[PDB]
Design a protein around this ligand. Structure first.
Ligand SMILES: [Mg+2]
Ligand code: NA
Length: 354
């Protein structure tokens, strides 16, 4: 039996010369055993869900602040940094954004002049959402995910930009307006990030590189790249990870790891073990070696890496379980973190605290 998390060395303190150590949280986790683990080990937090656009402005002019406020309060009380996830995304985003003045979807519009008016209305709505949110949280947030997942996994257009509703209505303009709006209301010292998954592999990596180069050339304020790092044991390679961070550091950008989890599976995650108990020791060992190499790379790169956030605290709460159940008939368990479902350490803990 492994010791409890509160009996081992703080991860945040272990990494205090290199980068923050963060966790994605929900408001209900900010007391009890999670509360304790958080305070002991972490010096940054992010909202898993409560600061996404639909969580903050579910109807126009109607702001729901309480979950988000509770997260901010917890960070302040415990002297934690706070990442804002996220100003702009194509999911968990309210439908009302994308409806024209008569209530019909803007994407359906064929008259070029009405389309231009729709583009301007959506951009103005985006600006209002950003202005309102940034005004409330500008003195708490230490890193903004200003846009999330705006780059495509393939190449549907020459710039590799995701053809979401934002793109269909505004082209790339939503991205420019989101950064400029955030800079304007948060101030010059605010740290603005473009966040995405699979930043280590091509062609996405290069499309993202080209996008940030382009926007920097136009004076669009971007401070860094957020690497979600939803990764596996063998993929991507350490070198793929390294190369991606070095490329962005080459443009004068900061890197953060924002949503780290190390799945026990491939993609899709099948076959998956049905219970935590069913997972063999070998999975935890191979994960531990993987985590060792990750954190050695993060330390080597620490001039260009300011924060490493995990997408959860302990293995009792992870969205990888939703994915395992989805691809295995509603039955499956992943185990991505250094802390097990009882808040005891896992073999990976030892390999990143040393
Ligand atoms: Mg180590
Ligand atoms: Na650093």
């Amino acid at each position: 039996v492994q010791p409890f998390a509160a009996q081992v060395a703080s991860l945040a303190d272990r990494y205090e010369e290199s980068f923050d150590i963060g966790a994605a949280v929900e408001p209900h986790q900010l007391n009890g055993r999670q509360g304790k683990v958080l305070k002991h080990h972490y010096n940054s937090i992010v909202a898993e869900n409560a600061m996404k656009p639909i969580s903050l402005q579910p109807e126009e002019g109607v702001f729901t602040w309480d979950g988000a406020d509770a997260i901010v309060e917890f960070a302040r009380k415990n002297n934690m940094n706070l990442r804002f996830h996220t100003l702009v995304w194509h999911n968990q985003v309210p439908d009302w954004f994308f409806l024209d003045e008569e209530g019909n979807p803007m994407v359906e519009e064929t008259n070029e002049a009405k389309r231009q008016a729709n583009k301007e209305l959506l951009l103005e709505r985006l600006e209002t959402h950003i202005k309102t949110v940034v005004e409330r949280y500008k003195d708490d947030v230490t890193a903004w995910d200003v846009v999330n997942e705006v780059v495509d996994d393939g190449t549907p257009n020459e710039r590799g930009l995701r053809e979401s509703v934002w793109y269909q209505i505004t082209g790339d303009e939503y991205i420019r307006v989101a950064f400029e709006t955030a800079r304007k209301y948060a101030g010059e010292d605010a740290k603005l990030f473009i966040n995405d998954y699979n930043t280590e592999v091509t062609p996405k990596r290069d499309h993202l590189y080209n996008l940030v180069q382009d926007l920097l050339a136009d004076g669009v304020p971007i401070d860094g790249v957020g690497h979600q790092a939803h990764i596996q044991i063998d993929w991507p390679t350490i070198d793929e990870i390294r190369t991606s961070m070095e490329m962005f550091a080459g443009l004068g950008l900061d890197n953060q790891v924002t949503e780290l989890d190390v799945s026990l599976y491939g993609w899709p995650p099948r076959p998956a073990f049905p219970t935590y108990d069913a997972i063999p020791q070998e999975r935890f060992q191979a994960q531990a070696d993987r985590y060792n190499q990750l954190f050695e790379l993060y330390e080597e790169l620490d001039a260009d890496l300011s924060s490493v956030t995990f997408w959860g605290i302990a293995d009792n709460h992870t969205w990888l379980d939703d994915r395992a159940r989805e691809y295995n008939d509603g039955v499956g368990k992943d185990a991505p973190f250094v802390f097990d479902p009882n808040y005891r350490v896992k073999p990976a803990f030892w390999r990143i605290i040393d």
